[PDB]
Amino acid sequence: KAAPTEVSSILESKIRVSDEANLDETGRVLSVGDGIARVFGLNNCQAEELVEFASGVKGMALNLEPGQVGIVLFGSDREVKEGEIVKRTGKIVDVPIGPGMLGRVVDALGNPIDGKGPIEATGYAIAQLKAPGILPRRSVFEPMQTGLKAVDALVPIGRGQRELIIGDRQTGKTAVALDTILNQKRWNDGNDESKKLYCVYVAVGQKRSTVAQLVQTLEQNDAMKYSIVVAATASEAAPLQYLAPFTACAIAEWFRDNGKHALIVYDDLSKQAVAYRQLSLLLRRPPGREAYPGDVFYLHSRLLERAAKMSDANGGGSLTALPVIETQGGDVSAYIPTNVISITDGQIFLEAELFYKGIRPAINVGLSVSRVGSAAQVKAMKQVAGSLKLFLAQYREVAAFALDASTKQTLSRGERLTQLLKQKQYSPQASEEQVPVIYAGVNGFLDNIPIERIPEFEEQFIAYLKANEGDILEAIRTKGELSSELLDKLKSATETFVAT
Amino acid sequence: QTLEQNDAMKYSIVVAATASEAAPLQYLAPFTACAIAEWFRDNGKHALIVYDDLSKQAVAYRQLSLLLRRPPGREAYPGDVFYLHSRLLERAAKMSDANGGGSLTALPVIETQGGDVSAYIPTNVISITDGQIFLEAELFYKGIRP
Amino acid sequence: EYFRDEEGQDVLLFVDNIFRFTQAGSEVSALLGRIPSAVGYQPTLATDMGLLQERITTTRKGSVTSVQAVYVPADDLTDPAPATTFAHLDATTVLSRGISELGIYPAVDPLDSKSRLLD
Amino acid sequence: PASGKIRAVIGAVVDVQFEQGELPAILNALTIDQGNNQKLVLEVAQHLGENAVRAIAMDGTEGLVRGQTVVDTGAPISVPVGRGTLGRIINVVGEPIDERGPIECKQRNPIHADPPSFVEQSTEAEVLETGIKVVDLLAPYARGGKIGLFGGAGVGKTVFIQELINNIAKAHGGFSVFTGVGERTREGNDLYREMKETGVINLEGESKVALVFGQMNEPPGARARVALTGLTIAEYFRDEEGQDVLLFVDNIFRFTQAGSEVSALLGRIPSAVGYQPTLATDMGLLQERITTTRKGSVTSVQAVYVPADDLTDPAPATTFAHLDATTVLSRGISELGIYPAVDPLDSKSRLLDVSVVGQEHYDVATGVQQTLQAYKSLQDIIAILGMDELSEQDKLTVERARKIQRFLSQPFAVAEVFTGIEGKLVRLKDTIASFKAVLEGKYDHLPENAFYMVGGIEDVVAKAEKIAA
Amino acid sequence: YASEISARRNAMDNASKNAGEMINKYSILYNRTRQAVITNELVDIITGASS
């Protein structure tokens, strides 16, 4: 029947003289709980502005009503008590960006957690930035080499597109994003700035031991010198894990607006949706489907729309987004699975049935597709893999229901192509080595070999083609296509090596 | 327009209640249409009311009650959900010889979702009326109309 | 609406998608004082959808062929934003998720798509 | 001392009113004098304003009047740590419940503390040697992670926890900490008497495992804080003394259900399947503290229980994301002739790779898992077509799969009174060399019963030569 | 008779294996429907008590 704001403590300060300290920027903490802080004051404070408590905990003023202001704490609830003096930074929720962040592991607010000292940032970009329109955008034409043989020939990715990575646990969701960042060392170590792509791993929701083990493997293979790591474990607050997707997109957007390519990996997209729903449920909101708020679809669509390809008048850069969706038992028609598939241009389904049989990675040809992956691919790999996506999906349905003469030819050619395209962990291939292995399995040059000799035939053909025919391998990587002279030389070298 | 061309709109009352109006107009469409047809049954004539549909009247009553600061019940509906449909259908009964000899027929259509008749608004209207006409969607597509 | 009433022309309204109009109003209905409805929706679901669908019809001055598209909430036709829009359309084209994985281009469900001109 | 007055008392939630400026912070233990009890602990949750903060009592609030004295301790719920808590039954407030005198501890650490940072964590995942043949080769335990012990009643859950704590204290020198949160009244008394007869808890000698009492007969504050009291004693041995401690939370499903009970009674709205909204925050605050630091590590061997046989629930999927290993104990063995009932195909771990265990350990684990999976799927055809209606390659693989399933089941040291055999503690190097020689054809002429109830390559040669002559 | 009895054993084994895959898919749908029914019933009682 009454009202809040002025009550007992806040009602005995206006009767005398509520001055002294500046109440427009600072304020007294009246209540704290459930990751919130009801600060009394903040008159000149703008919406979504950065705040700071007396103990050093940061805050974000969300709602600004009359007499009170709801501040969302980004840390523990024990660092803010009743009667504390807060302070505002004067700006919004920004983070550090620039070329000096390459080689260090930052957190959600931009502070370094690797112990390498301070980060030499060249500016300050806000986390809640609007995406570009249709005038400063262009079509995706650059090719993004991932290293896997089953991903560069089926559903290829490009610079400026959003390729999702749905799947269950222990199927190959995080393994596909780690192989694409380590395969960019052949172009980033040279002098070609247009072919390089800076990685941006944003580990959100992962454990503390998993984030430290993944950073040590990339540094040993010369891949952590040009890759940003956004550490965001589940042991922090709910505001730190939910803002990890917005803070990582602002640092990678500086390279696309100046003349460089970027690749963001939001691992995972399912962990970011659970952290945003925890802070919204404590502020008395309406829960829709799967205990989620009404703004659940707007949080993932706004962060993925900024990763686009700019035109020639904006710099010529692009930003690639690789979101990993964690499904519960292969349920692709969930509430968080339908929102990520309707905003991205393609997805990579990772089934758990083929992952336990040895097919690593388990990429379903009948479920995973690429919208802007046909024009944003290499001409040499697309010419050798004629109708590779249509033949892979038809061979899986015929083998599950099966001895005719026509069915025996499709079963022998489909088994050799699936085993040769399955690579091991941390073993990426280039565009010239994957074009020679995919042309032998589609022309019938691997049908005479056995099923168990599929792994030995890939290593023997790649080594013989790099010493006895170096002119054919170097022409497919520099030019990127194969004409009449390049197609005739590749068929003669594969036929002579298969008979010996 | 189809009833006027077949000589049938001269003795038929049409209660226009579209979904583009307010929630109070669609919820009161069942009580207003029953009052006009009750005048012929109390004098010595027969009437036939058609509440199309019964599923649309339940959603209009829950929208006006939720905005008036009231507690909801089951399936985000009001507490007197079963009392609203049973009171409007109980008035359409056959009178005796001392009351005029008239009667009133009620034809309430229930819009289901996938043939589910075990819902909240489906089971409440089936246990108040004297019989129901089940319209399955399997035999309607083969050609057996109705 | 101005090209069919003031000019008298057969306009063609193409909305993509039509389910975004009801989902956008449900997120702002909790801060305006309204209570939540079914599946956390707004209480005026049938009133807001009926006021916009009735104006995109054919009148005496001109016609208006509305070709909108609805989005199923997590593959469910019994939701409050999918079942309420089926009573304001002459022809419906439901796309099932089970027929799209078999090879049907597109996944036109013959047991669920109905129209009023099938006579 | 900061004193307060009780203003509200609605069950476990008790509101205390303090003065201006002397109010307590969050997660602060409040003392309260009672009758027969010593002190009623009350952890502070949040501050409602107007010099008032709601608290949750960790005991029974029956008999409290409006206006009682509530003293503030100034910090969180402290507990006794060190070597003095070994062999004694401690509670959630750090008090003894074994009637063996008070725990003479030098210092008292709080139960509410932050975890390790990103610069003080382990950069490489190390394997933890348990001593078992089926655990050091198949699902290896990670140094500083979580391991799920799934199994039914009478399969071997209590015997596996006692044998693993004794083998780690003799080969590595690490203590244990059994924190039975959400246990029953009869299960707590039977676990303490069984450990004294085997040599794990000695009243007059030297103990090696801590006992933390946490039954479900108390309120919601004592059951939710039972996980923080047991983890604080195990973390002190790895940071101050430097030892690979092993924490046991029986069961793991009782920790997630106890946290949602105190949150729903305070005013928070529920999430999904009747769970609390801070499901990912409460489970992550206690799982990240049992990691590997620069001085030591802290392994976790909790017993995860699925809700009504559902792995995609809110209490099963949240705890499986931080589990590195899994010790599944199915009911297929047990009485079949395997000690213990350890599934070689259902128990999986994330540390069973070639970049953590090496190329030699990865080849032996892949060969043993392939032979056991082919023999289990071919059991339906051997019962309908016999054993002689096979090829040459199928007959040799079926004979080697029967002896490999019994070689990994070695007799523990604490289970010598049930089987009669001696306790065998095979190391990591001896278990990998014995499995590689049997798969190559060096032990093809040996019998199938020579590998049962044995451990290592030296035990199979001495048991085969003494069986016939 | 021996060929019909041998063919009936293969049809019975295929029907038993197909029933196990359908029971596993129905168990995943029943587990998700049981958790959604508890969340929908608890949301209706919490909305009416707070208004």
Ligand SMILES: Nc1ncnc2c1ncn2[C@@H]1O[C@H](COP(=O)(O)OP(=O)(O)O)[C@@H](O)[C@H]1O
């Ligand atoms: N090409 C491969 N060869 C062998 N094993 C692989 C390959 N790719 C992935 N894996 C295995 O898959 C597992 C994936 O683990 P993790 O990333 O935690 O789950 P998810 O992939 O579902 O995110 C790894 O432990 C790794 O051993």
Ligand SMILES: Nc1ncnc2c1ncn2[C@@H]1O[C@H](COP(=O)(O)OP(=O)(O)O)[C@@H](O)[C@H]1O
């Ligand atoms: N290595 C072993 N050899 C023989 N029997 C064992 C072994 N380990 C456990 N057991 C048997 O398993 C039983 C476990 O009993 P109990 O601890 O009450 O159930 P649970 O193990 O489910 O807690 C014991 O009775 C014991 O005889």
Ligand SMILES: [Mg+2]
């Ligand atoms: Mg991952």
